[PDB]
Design an enzyme around this catalytic site. Structure first.
Site, short mmCIF file in Angstrom:
data_model
loop_
_atom_site.label_atom_id
_atom_site.label_comp_id
_atom_site.label_asym_id
_atom_site.label_seq_id
_atom_site.Cartn_x
_atom_site.Cartn_y
_atom_site.Cartn_z
CG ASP A 144 20.39 -15.70 5.93
OD1 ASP A 144 19.47 -15.49 5.11
OD2 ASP A 144 20.49 -16.76 6.58
NE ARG A 194 19.08 -18.55 8.21
CZ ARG A 194 17.82 -18.16 8.07
NH1 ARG A 194 17.07 -17.98 9.15
NH2 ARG A 194 17.33 -17.89 6.87
CE1 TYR A 238 25.60 -22.75 0.90
CE2 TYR A 238 26.03 -20.69 2.08
CZ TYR A 238 25.38 -21.38 1.07
OH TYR A 238 24.49 -20.73 0.24
CG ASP A 246 20.74 -15.40 12.13
OD1 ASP A 246 20.41 -14.68 13.09
OD2 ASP A 246 20.53 -15.10 10.92
#
EC number: 5.4.99.25
Length: 305
Positions: free
Chosen positions: A39, A172, A67, A81
RNA sequence: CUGUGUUCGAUCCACAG
RNA sequence: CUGUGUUCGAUCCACAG
RNA sequence: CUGUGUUCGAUCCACAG
């Protein structure tokens, strides 16, 4: 004309395709793609495929990723987000202790619903395009796997940690779910993909600040790609055959490295050249040939390279 | 071409037909 | 090896849309 | 899927010389 994989680093801001455009620009090459979208608000490893290298990008979809997220509790946006329009921003009243419980109860697999802002398709349309249109879709949950969560740091509604996840997992969504457990919602404010499979962020190349020559030297050639897949060599005479589309038979062979039937292995030219990727028709130990061929089924042949 | 996929602005990459 | 495959005989690659 | 590929790019099959 180079062929292969580039471990690119995408800074916060650009879309993943922006990275692809930078590479097409600097290398003056048309055939470029990536192996897994990051993203715009995130940064980290983005796998880039150049020329014939785009043809092995599919193999990166199944790798594990690592991550490092930071989320803000009590905040909820449309995109899940920090770039999304805020929908709610309450004050989560929870104690380090519960927060700790909720984040580690996700460890192990579970059924994750993807964000409305995603690349999934619904009747030919992207889910993020429908969302911009104001059509928020909740697709069926996908069986996801969170292998482990570490380096947890808390302070206020600011929670961060690292996490290794299985293919198809949305961080997310994970943040929002944890927030749901704590019963107050959470939204991802920073996200860093530290690794994709074996490729790490330490070896990633920021293509936006790199000159074309180093981007070029940074490309991993085909023979060195998918090194986690079993090798196999054929007689230097069988090459032209294979390159013509000839399936692989015991006849044309040489050395192998064991491979469970169905396994994808890379056929080598014994001169080093990668000729193709093929699927195992059986277990490689069956040197039993008191008679009769058919061994590896052609998956992709690297003609003209 | 159509379809699906990939952590969201791939019509651009991949895979299937 | 040469011809024909009865509405471009079957199939594998690759490239393009 | 629709097209392309110096006897087909490559391999087969069926008929006949």
């Amino acid at each position: 004309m180079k062929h292969g994989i580039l471990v690119a680093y995408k800074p916060k801001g650009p879309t993943s395709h922006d990275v692809v455009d930078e590479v097409r620009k600097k290398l003056k090459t048309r055939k470029v793609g990536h192996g897994g979208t990051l993203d715009p608000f995130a940064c980290g490893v983005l796998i880039i495929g150049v020329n014939q290298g785009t043809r092995i990008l599919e193999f990166y979809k199944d790798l594990k990723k690592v991550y490092w997220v930071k989320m803000r509790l009590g905040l909820i946006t449309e995109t899940f987000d920090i770039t999304g329009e805020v929908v709610e921003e309450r004050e989560c009243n929870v104690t380090e202790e519960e927060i700790r419980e909720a984040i580690f109860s996700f460890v192990g697999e579970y059924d994750q619903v993807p964000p409305a802002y995603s690349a999934k398709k619904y009747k030919g349309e992207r889910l993020y395009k429908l969302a911009r249109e104001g059509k928020i879709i909740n697709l069926p949950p996908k069986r996801v796997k969170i292998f482990k969560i570490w380096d947890v740091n808390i302070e206020g509604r600011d929670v961060s940690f690292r996490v290794e996840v299985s293919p198809g997992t949305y961080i997310r969504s994970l943040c929002m779910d944890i927030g749901y457990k704590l019963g107050c919602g959470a939204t991802a404010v920073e996200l860093v993909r530290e690794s994709v499979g074996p490729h790490t962020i330490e070896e990633s190349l920021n293509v936006f600040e790199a000159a074309p020559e180093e981007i070029e030297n940074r490309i991993i050639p085909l023979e060195k790609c998918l090194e986690w897949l079993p090798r196999v060599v054929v007689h230097q005479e069988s090459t032209k055959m294979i390159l013509n589309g000839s399936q692989i038979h015991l006849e044309m062979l040489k050395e192998w490295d064991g491979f469970k039937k169905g396994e994808v292995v890379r056929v080598f030219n014994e001169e080093g050249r990668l000729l193709a990727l093929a699927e195992a028709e059986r277990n490689s130990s069956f040197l039993e040939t008191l008679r009769k061929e058919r061994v590896l089924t052609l998956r992709k042949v690297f003609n003209t390279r």
